[PDB]
């Protein structure tokens, strides 16, 4: 259980590394999402102001 216990400690550490890595990718994704959902909300406000400018 000497290298059976070190072997479990190594896996546990590797498991921790991926969990932390996933939340860092989650945030990364969220920064791209802000841009996306923001890019749509601009052109909807664009098309209303074009419409009431053209009514005039």
């Amino acid at each position: 259980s000497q290298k059976n216990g070190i072997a479990t400690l190594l896996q546990a550490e590797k498991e921790a590394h991926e969990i932390v890595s996933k939340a860092r990718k989650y945030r990364q994704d969220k920064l791209k999402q802000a841009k996306t959902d923001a890019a749509k909300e601009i052109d909807s406000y664009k098309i209303q102001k074009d419409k009431e400018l053209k009514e005039f």
Partner: peptide, 14 residues
């Protein structure tokens, strides 16, 4: 530094 590698690979192999 060679011996603390020889005596700590052995501890993992045990």
């Amino acid at each position: 530094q060679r011996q603390v590698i020889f005596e700590c690979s052995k501890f993992i192999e045990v």
